[PDB]
Every structure is written in C-alpha cells, then in structure tokens.
C-alpha cells in the first residue's frame, strides 16, 4: 500500500492505525523517534512525535500496548485498542512477532513509522476478515484480549518497588556463600583452579581426580553426580552464580530514574498456551519456595503507605483437570473440601479410609504432580523412590481411582488427530500437527502439548479474565495491578484498605467463571512480596 497521492497533514482522522519506531530499546526507556497513522488510502506522518501523541484517541495498530506504556510515562491516558498481533495470536498461537506475523499473512514489517502504519492497517483488515466467521475466537478478543491490553499497558507502567538496601545487602552475603563453596571445591580437588574454564575444570575432573569420562562428555557434570563430592559442590556454584548475575545485581541497574520502580515488561503473544510471560527480568524462573528465590522476593517492596496484596489460585491445574474431565471422584475431593493429596493416597493404596499412611501421601503429590504433563514410569521411580513394577502399577491405580482423567485425555488425542488441533475451555486452541508425525521424539512431544494445552491454557485464561474484571473496580479503590506471575497476581492498595481491597480481589478472582469446583484463592497482605506470602 499505498498508491496515487497519499501523504497527509498530521493530524489523522479518529481510527487511524497507528505506526512507531522507539530506540531499539522497550518502552519505559525508550524515546518516540518517529510517528504515523494510515487511514482510507493515505498516511500522516507526525512532526514531532511526542506533542503528536496528545491528538489520538486510541493506540490502535501493532503493538499498541508499547505506546500506551511509553504515553502512560508521559502523563497521556491513550488505550491501546485493535491490535493485528492479537488477532493472528488468536488465529494460531505460534504468531509470537509481527515479523513473524507480516511474513505469513503478507507483509514485510520495517523500521519505518508510516509503513509500520500501513502494514497495520491491512493485517487488521486481512486478519478480521479471517476471524468474525469465528464465533469462540471473536469472544476471546472482545472479552479477554483487548481488555487485557490496557491493563498489562497499567501494570507495565506503574512499576514495582524495590528495596535497594537489601539487594546490596543481599549481594555480599550470596558472595560470601560462593566463597565458601569455592573454598570446598577446593579442598576436594587438591590445588586451586578456575572454576570458570573449562580447560582447568576438564583436566580436575578426568585426569587429577580420574572421574570417570574422556563439561566433555555429554554434560557430564549434570551426570556425574555421583562420583566425588565435588560435581555436587560444583553445580551449587554454576546456580548461585546464575542467580547472583541475574537476579540480585542487576535488578538496582533497572530501576528507573524518573518513577523510581521497576518496570518489568508483560507480554500476551509469547508463550505457546496463552499464559503471560515476563522480560528483564524474567519473573518466571526466580526459584520459588527456596531459600535464594525468597531471598529475592523480599526485594520487592509496597511504596511507604502502602500494603501489597498476593493472591494466588490453589490447584489450578487439577481443579480444571476435574472440570474438563468431568471426574465424579476428582470433583468430589475438591467440592467437599478435601486434600487431594490425601485423598488420591487413600484411593490408590485403599487403606481404610484416611489413616496411618504419611509415605502414602509422598507417593500421591508425585503421580498428581506427575500426570499433569506425562511423568514416565522410569522417572516417577527415580523420583518416588521405586522400581519398574510398581511403577507402572501405581500409573494404573492412579485411573482406576480417577478413570475419567484417562477418558478425557484418550478422547483429546483422539480428536486432536482428527480436528488437527486442540482448544481450551473457552475456545482458544493451538494446532498440534505432529500427533501423527511417525517420528517417535515428536509424536510424544506433540502429545505432551496436547494434553497439556486444555490445561494450562484454561488456567491462563481464568487468570486472564479475572484481570479484565478485576482492573475497574480496583480503579475505583484507588488500588493498583503490579505484578503477574504463575497463578498468582500481586496488588498494591494503600494501608487504610488494603483489608477491603483483598476482600474484593478473592472474591472476582474465585468468581470469574461458573465451573463445577470452587477455584480456591490463597491471600496475603505483607510490606513485601515475601511477607504477603499466606
């Protein structure tokens, strides 16, 4: 696009697209270089970009949460709206960037703002033409995209506190630890060595204490845990290390200088289920429930005045597991109240009733945990300490308890083969056409996703519903959405009401949807996330 005579006065007409190019960077920390919008067959260019800002009504166009973010810095209250990269996620979930998505649906996406414009503009048109004929699709969209926009154009640009004292604080302690451990890897091996190259550390490991190989072979300290002391004491360090270099020192060089936070970066095109995902930092991967990844958790502090508010969904998983499977046993635990790690103990092993076990109940959380994404027989041994007898047997006492779990996923595979895809509770599906692959590797890869995608993905979408309804009526608290992360959701509310506002976050968040279980919703108000952690 587009042809004849097309360049036009700023400002657009009302429902242009928008187009922007930001300094190779992510927008709290990046500056608007150039500006346009598309509209009918031509195409403003602003000029100058940020006084341009003020005269759009909307952000609508590829990636319009990244403006409204940058225009959120600013002091503008510009909603991100129609978005191309929401309709082609929909579409298919492998849609991850808008090269990616401007190479399959026509297009060639460049760093140039009016044509940044134009390709908006048609991969809206093209896109929405594919979807209205898309009954659970549209809804999606409507009821659960585009809303989420806005609030992840929020959470992204508020920030989140953190205590710099204490990451500096926290830095030399872990320093110390690595000490420490280093001083062992020492004296275990003989003399000092770098434990950073690879030379030194090949000529330790198979030659001055003869371990047993010819990193080297395989990766072979992640196998060779079983000789020496050492390869144990070794993989401490290589951990610690990665968390000291990614979580504790960089995180004060983030924070910002005009707001004072950190500002994580949300993004809702990026993981194959539908679940959002974080960027520097990586949220996801801080070690939970362990010493070092609580550590970095108490970092994250309310602004003076103010409580944060965790909330966090139980068992997600198996509760919608229960639902989609339409389980009379599973449903029953969870409906009355029961610990399905009990339960399942009592069911698998028929012990009268609830009695004299606990081992029982280790064995249990191991198949629970385990079926959820296809734990095999030789892993669920070597983690529930078994042989490959019972093991298998214990796979089977597992759907004889719950019969219709094995239903369920016998008729999704099934109907994943024929359909060429599988789908959420709602409607969101991803495509899964190696199930058939004859390849062996990829067909038990594309069956792991199968199975799992009606689960993970739903638990994502309750997540996501939850927000959308939940962001108004916090507005109209004068709380705020931080941070998102797991199947939990941490708020900020001032101290006079953060008691209500957690009242009121519960509630919307066990409410969003009618299903055949409670959704139950742990909650914990504190002065930083770890203290909230109840």
């Given at each position: 696009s587009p042809k004849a005579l097309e360049e036009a006065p700023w400002p657009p007409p009302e429902g242009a697209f928008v187009g922007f190019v930001?300094?190779?960077?992510?927008?709290?920390?990046?500056?608007?270089?150039?500006?346009?919008?598309?509209?009918?067959?031509?195409?403003?260019?602003?000029?100058?970009?940020?006084?341009?800002?003020?005269?759009?009504?909307?952000?609508?166009?590829?990636?319009?949460?990244?403006?409204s973010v940058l225009a959120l810095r600013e002091g503008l209250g510009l909603p991100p709206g129609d978005d191309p990269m929401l309709l082609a996620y929909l579409l298919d979930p492998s849609n991850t960037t808008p090269e990616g998505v401007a190479r399959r649906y026509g297009g060639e996406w460049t760093e140039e703002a009016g044509e940044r414009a134009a390709l908006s503009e048609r991969l809206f048109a093209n896109l929405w033409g594919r979807l209205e004929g898309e009954e659970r699709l549209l809804w999606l969209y409507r009821e659960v995209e585009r809303p989420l926009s806005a609030v992840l154009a929020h959470m992204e640009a508020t920030g989140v506190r953190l205590d710099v004292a204490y990451l500096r604080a926290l830095s030399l302690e872990?320093?110390?630890?690595?000490?420490?451990?280093?001083?062992?890897?020492?004296?275990?091996?003989?003399?000092?060595?770098?434990?950073?190259?690879?030379?030194?550390?090949?000529r330790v490991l198979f030659d001055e204490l003869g371990l047993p190989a010819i990193s080297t072979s395989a990766a072979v300290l992640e196998a060779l845990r079983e000789a020496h002391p050492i390869v144990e004491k070794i993989l401490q360090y290589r951990e610690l290390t990665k968390l000291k270099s990614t979580y504790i020192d960089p995180l004060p060089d983030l924070i910002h200088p005009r707001t004072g936070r950190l500002h994580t970066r949300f993004n809702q095109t990026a993981t194959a289920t539908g679940r959002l995902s974080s960027s520097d930092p990586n949220l996801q991967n801080?070690?939970?429930?362990?010493?070092?990844?609580?550590?970095?958790?108490?970092?994250?502090?309310?602004?003076?005045?103010?409580?944060?508010?965790?909330?966090?969904?139980?068992?997600?998983?198996?509760?919608?597991?229960?639902?989609?499977?339409?389980?009379?046993?599973?449903?029953?635990?969870?409906?009355?109240?029961?610990?399905?790690?009990?339960?399942?103990?009592?069911?698998?092993?028929?012990?009268?009733?609830?009695?004299?076990?606990?081992l029982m109940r280790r064995a249990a959380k191991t198949i629970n945990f385990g079926v959820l994404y296809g734990m095999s027989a030789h892993r669920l041994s070597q983690e529930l300490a078994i042989p490959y007898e019972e093991a298998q047997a214990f796979?089977?006492?597992?759907?004889?308890?719950?019969?219709?779990?094995?239903a369920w996923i016998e008729k999704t595979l099934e109907e994943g083969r024929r359909r060429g895809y599988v789908?959420?509770?709602?409607?969101?599906?991803?495509?899964?056409?190696?199930?058939?692959?004859?390849?062996?590797?990829?067909?038990?890869?594309?069956?792991?996703?199968?199975?799992?995608?009606?689960?993970?993905?739903?638990?994502?979408?309750?997540?996501?519903?939850?927000?959308?309804?939940?962001?108004?009526?916090?507005?109209?608290?004068?709380?705020?959405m931080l941070l998102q992360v797991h199947d939990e959701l941490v708020l900020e509310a001032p101290k006079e009401?953060?008691?209500?506002?957690?009242?009121?976050?519960?509630?919307?968040?066990?409410?969003?949807?009618?299903?055949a279980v409670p959704l139950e919703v742990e909650v914990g108000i504190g002065e930083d996330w770890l203290s909230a952690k109840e």
């Open positions: 930001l300094s190779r960077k992510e927008p709290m920390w990046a500056d608007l270089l150039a500006l346009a919008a598309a509209r009918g067959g031509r195409v403003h260019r602003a000029p100058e970009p940020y006084k341009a800002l003020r005269d759009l009504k909307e952000a609508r166009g590829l990636l319009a949460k990244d403006l872990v320093a110390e630890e690595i000490a420490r451990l280093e001083a062992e890897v020492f004296r275990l091996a003989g003399h000092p060595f770098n434990l950073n190259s690879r030379d030194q550390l090949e801080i070690p939970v429930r362990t010493p070092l990844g609580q550590r970095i958790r108490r970092a994250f502090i309310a602004e003076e005045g103010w409580l944060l508010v965790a909330l966090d969904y139980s068992q997600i998983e198996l509760r919608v597991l229960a639902h989609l499977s339409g389980d009379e046993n599973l449903i029953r635990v969870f409906q009355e109240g029961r610990d399905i790690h009990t339960e399942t103990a009592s069911w698998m092993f028929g012990v009268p009733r609830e009695a004299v076990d606990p796979i089977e006492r597992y759907f004889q308890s719950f019969p219709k779990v094995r789908e959420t509770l709602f409607g969101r599906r991803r495509y899964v056409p190696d199930l058939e692959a004859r390849v062996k590797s990829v067909r038990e890869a594309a069956e792991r996703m199968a199975f799992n995608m009606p689960v993970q993905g739903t638990a994502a979408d309750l997540m996501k519903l939850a927000m959308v309804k939940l962001f108004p009526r916090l507005e109209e608290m004068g709380a705020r009401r953060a008691e209500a506002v957690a009242r009121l976050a519960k509630e919307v968040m066990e409410g969003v949807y009618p299903l």
